[PDB]
Amino acid sequence: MDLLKRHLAPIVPDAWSAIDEEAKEIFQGHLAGRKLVDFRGPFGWEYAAVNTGELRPIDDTPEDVDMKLRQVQPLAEVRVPFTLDVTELDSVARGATNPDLDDVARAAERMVEAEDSAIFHGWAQAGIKGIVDSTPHEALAVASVSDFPRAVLSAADTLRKAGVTGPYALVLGPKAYDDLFAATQDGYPVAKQVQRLVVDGPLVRANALAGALVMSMRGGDYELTVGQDLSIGYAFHDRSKVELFVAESFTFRVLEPGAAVHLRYA
Amino acid sequence: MDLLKRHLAPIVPDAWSAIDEEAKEIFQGHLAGRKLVDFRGPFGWEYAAVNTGELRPIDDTPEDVDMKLRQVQPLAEVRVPFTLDVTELDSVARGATNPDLDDVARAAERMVEAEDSAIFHGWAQAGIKGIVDSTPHEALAVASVSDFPRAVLSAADTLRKAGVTGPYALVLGPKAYDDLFAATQDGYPVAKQVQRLVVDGPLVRANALAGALVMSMRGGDYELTVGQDLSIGYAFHDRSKVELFVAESFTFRVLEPGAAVHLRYA
Amino acid sequence: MDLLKRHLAPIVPDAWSAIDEEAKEIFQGHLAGRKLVDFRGPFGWEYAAVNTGELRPIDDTPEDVDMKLRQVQPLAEVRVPFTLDVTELDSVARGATNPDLDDVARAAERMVEAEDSAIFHGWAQAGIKGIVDSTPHEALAVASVSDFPRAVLSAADTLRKAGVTGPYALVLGPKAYDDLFAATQDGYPVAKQVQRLVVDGPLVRANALAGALVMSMRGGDYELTVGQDLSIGYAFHDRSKVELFVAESFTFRVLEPGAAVHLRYA
Amino acid sequence: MDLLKRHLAPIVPDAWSAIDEEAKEIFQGHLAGRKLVDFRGPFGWEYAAVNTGELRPIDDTPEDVDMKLRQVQPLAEVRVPFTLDVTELDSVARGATNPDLDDVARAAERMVEAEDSAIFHGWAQAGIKGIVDSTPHEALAVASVSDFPRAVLSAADTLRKAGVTGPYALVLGPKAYDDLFAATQDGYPVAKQVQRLVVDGPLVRANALAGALVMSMRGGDYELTVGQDLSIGYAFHDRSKVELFVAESFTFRVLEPGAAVHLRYA
Amino acid sequence: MDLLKRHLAPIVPDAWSAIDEEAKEIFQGHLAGRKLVDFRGPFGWEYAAVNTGELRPIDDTPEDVDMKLRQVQPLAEVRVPFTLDVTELDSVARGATNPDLDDVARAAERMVEAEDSAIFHGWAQAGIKGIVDSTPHEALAVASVSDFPRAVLSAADTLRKAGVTGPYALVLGPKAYDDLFAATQDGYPVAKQVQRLVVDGPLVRANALAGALVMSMRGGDYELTVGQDLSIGYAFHDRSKVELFVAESFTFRVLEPGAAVHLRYA
Amino acid sequence: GSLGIGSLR
Amino acid sequence: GSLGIGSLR
Amino acid sequence: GSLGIGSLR
Amino acid sequence: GSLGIGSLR
Amino acid sequence: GSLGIGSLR
């Protein structure tokens, strides 16, 4: 019996499989940050913090003693509750193939929002700095949907100016993806040109990213550490409802702040 | 001797082979629904209904008893009669290679009409709901043959808005197929653009579909269950004519109503 | 000693090889019908007729007797004479590599004309109906060289309207081939578009075809039966000239008249 | 000791290797005719003439005697002298990698000129008829650099009109190559179109060809026979200079005069 | 203990690995000359000079004696110092993944500048002649960013005029690369055209090249000899700083001066 | 004893 | 003893 | 006992 | 003892 | 004991 306590839930194994599949497909579809940054872990429930290898001096020390404190980045544990109907889960045992698992998708996208919002725009209460809020480069102000094929090159230029090599991925927020994929130049494709621009770089949709972003896929620049990977656990149940949660433990580090350029309002 | 009773027909084996080949090529050419939806079966002549796994409450029950009725979807059995000339079938035994099998093709396309009409536009007397009549999305009104390259994207957008991923197939009714494939932009192809639009999605012609349709090929959304697959059986014969039939047993279920968008008058 | 009687000719074996190669390359280059229709045989010199498997009633018969006559299609035997110089053939034995074999090519193209003219436009004295003269469809009147990319589609549409599936080959007469291959749209190719139009269908030149033609490559529609395949035989010789002939026995049947559409004056 | 007499030269083996490599790369780069026509040999120093297999009648003969003379085409032996500095060749033995071998390249291109001039424009003193001067077809007069994409097709048409099949190679003289490869249509390539025109036919530069030429690569039309292939021999040497030569023996025959069309002033 | 004296440095092995990786990635990213010219070596610390194989006469010699001096090209040894913080290197031992190695990159690009400046523009104090300053061809004056697609062809023409075959690489200085890669023709790519122009030739950025350059990749024209390849050595250290250096020994020879054409101000 | 059409994907 | 042309597909 | 998502590259 | 050029196709 | 760069072609 681990912390998920799944054997205590009034849920048949096939209903557990259905819940897990729903969450898994949502996560594989929507986790923007995980498909860009470098990935450490998972290390389990007792991994508490990432060792940075840095030391910080302590001022009030005697003359005969040199003392320094080791610097570490603690992980955040995130739990998103959701509820399911017990009868809907029971129907799986009678051969039902489409039980109502709406709240599973809701909780999974809430977890996706939490993780990607931390990765891109930081999370100050967790001591995390995002990719966007840590870049020293000036944010290109894109004026219209047709300025993107220019802007990216400019951003890419900046990346190779500062010394950041490697394929450059384009990350599009909600409006940017909508406007640049609902567009067509009288038959001639535009998004095809967009992928043609980036040298074997991926183009990814991030629902939590405001605006757009161009960032290196070189590696060693952005680091997501996961202690406990995305899991479904059981909390409680009444006669008719069962309370579950999505759980994860993670932290994110910006190793090289200059490997990305932000593109403002699409 | 099964229900087809073929050994009672005054038909030589090679004539049976010719009849079966004619029907088989018609069906492989024209069965639109079977090449889109998920397929269960065949299960044979005694498969009577699809278990949905749902329960429905019964109101007039005593206080000490909870009673529910299991919900099931019965299959429909469809038979399309046709007639053939006995002498034309006899000529096969003398080495004739092109016997008159026109009524075979007629009956086979009538069966195709029945099945595809049930799948796309429903069949209320059989308790079947079609793909088109069950979609909650608004039906895009296509104005002209050149609006299709736009409309599809719009529909596709809607599909990804509601949460329906996966490749999106385009299904064209008779007029839509005729007008969009009898078209050419001064040498530059249009239908090529149409297949280019859909991300590895098929483009299929449905003679029973009114208008056009964009629907996900993700799977798990639309379910055709077949008990007895398409068969040719013998009914009766006089001195000069033999009466045969095409037979099938099937039902169709819309598991996820939101996985398709209808495009109105082409 | 067969009917070709080649051992009686005053021709050395290498001269026979040269004659055969000349005829063979002409035939492989120019036989239009053989690369479109279905092929039966060869069956040799004693194959006399194709069994159709049909019966025809006989009117003047007694009441106690039913009599029918079997229907068959007799083959035609075609011989094209030509003459060669004996000294030119002797020079092959002295190491000459280019003997004068002009009349061989002349006779071979005459045989090609006979066969392809029978296949496409029929040969009433041989009881053969051609592809063009048996089609029930209306002949598209092509107005100019630029109307072909439209016309073909129209014809193709007709073919799929009547129920004829499969790849559709385009067959071009002499003028049509000349005008549509001596054409270029300011650098942009037109013939490339023509082959692009037909769905994996061949484009073939037929010197005996008047106009142009679009026909299905499905199979089972057009049937060329060959008894004795194209052969070179010896007839006679004087002191200085040797008389040879090209010989063939064949017949052609239109099994499905509706599988082709004629395009008139190019 | 063969006719090249190389062991008598005051040349170290590595200097011989360098001379041979220089000549070999020039010849592989510039021999236009050898990469088009059919090739017989090499047969060595004692091959004197090509047997044509033809006989020519002799007029003044007695009535009781028939006499004919065998026809043969004698080979021409070509020697191009050149001179090298002995000290430059000695420097190879001290590890020098770039000795002055300019006269080797000069003599090799002179030999290329002789051979290709014989092949394309004939050499009447050697009894050779060229490809260009033997063609019965009319020479297309190309007016401007943009007329080539048309002219070739015309020429190609002529080739298939007269009965000459097979891939058609384009051969460009100096000015034609310069003008048609120093050209670009505002970014869009022209030479790419030129190679696209010819059906898997090569496009070759011939420095000895005046104008341009379209000729069949079918085979059996043009025949270059080589007795002694291209060789470097020693003639004489003084204290400071060594005299070498390029040597070859060859003849060229036009078997089918109609397999090429000349394109005049580019 | 070699000349690098690395065992004397107060540096842990993993810090040495990090320093070497930083330098190695800079060098693989920026060494323009090494990816164009032919490469000899490395031969180690005691290789002192390249034997050219040439002799030079000496004037003041007696009549009975002929004396000549062997010609050789001595190598230059280049050392670029840099400094690192000892505590930053110590942090590697505590698990730090991003120590401050800025001066490593600075020194490595300084070495790249030295080597590439010698290769392209010569280094007279080292007795090296560059590719640009040794070419006899006239330097094409490029007027604007759109003149490059023309100019290259012109330069390429010159290269094939003088007799220099083989693929032709384009080498772009800083401004030329910036202007020709920050350019786009209203969606249509320009740099794609640039790589399309050169026949399987590479396009390389050289930070030390002024203007641009078109040069043959045939081989045997330009020769970089390396005695001691790029190495990191230790010089000295105080309590807080360690002094390291980048070291190399090399020379460059222009074997064929005519294999390149310079393009002036971009 | 059907025609064996089944699923057409 | 024909030329062996046969079908040309 | 996670869903086993891990890295998505 | 030639340069071995031969046919260039 | 170099960095092992060598030729970059």
Author numbering:
A (entry chain C), B (entry chain B), C (entry chain A), D (entry chain E), E (entry chain D): 1 to 266
F (entry chain 2), G (entry chain 1), H (entry chain 3), I (entry chain 5), J (entry chain 4): 117 to 125
Which lines from the publication concern this structure?
Encapsulins are protein nanocompartments that house various cargo enzymes, including a family of decameric ferritin-like proteins. Cargo enzymes are directed inside the encapsulin nanocompartment by a terminal localization sequence (LS) that binds to the interior face of the encapsulin. EncFtn oxidizes iron in a similar manner to other ferritins, but due to its open structure, it must be associated with an encapsulin nanocage to act as an iron store. Together, the encapsulin EncFtn (Enc:EncFtn) complex can perform both the oxidation and storage functions of classical ferritins. Here, we investigate the structure of the Enc:EncFtn nanocompartment from the halophilic bacterium Haliangium ochraceum to gain a better understanding of the arrangement and stoichiometry of the complex.
To capture the extreme open and closed conformations of the fivefold pores, we performed symmetry expansion on the I1 particle set in Relion3.1, followed by masked 3D classification without alignment centered on the vertex. The open conformation has a fivefold pore with an aperture diameter of approximately 15 Å, while in the closed conformation the aperture is reduced to 5-Å diameter. To allow for the widening of the pore, the open pentamer protrudes from the nanocompartment by 5 Å. However, this is the first time that an open pore conformation has been observed in an encapsulin protein. Our results suggest that the flexibility of the A-domain should also be considered when engineering the pore structure for enhanced transport across the encapsulin shell. In addition, our focused refinements of the pentameric subunits allowed us to build and sequence the 117GSLGIGSLR125 peptide from the EncFtn protein. This region of the LS forms a network of hydrophobic interactions with the inner face of the P-domain of a single encapsulin monomer, with further stabilization by several water-mediated backbone contacts. Our work suggests testable hypotheses for engineering pore selectivity, through modifications to the hinge regions between the P- and A-domains, which are responsible for the opening of the pore.
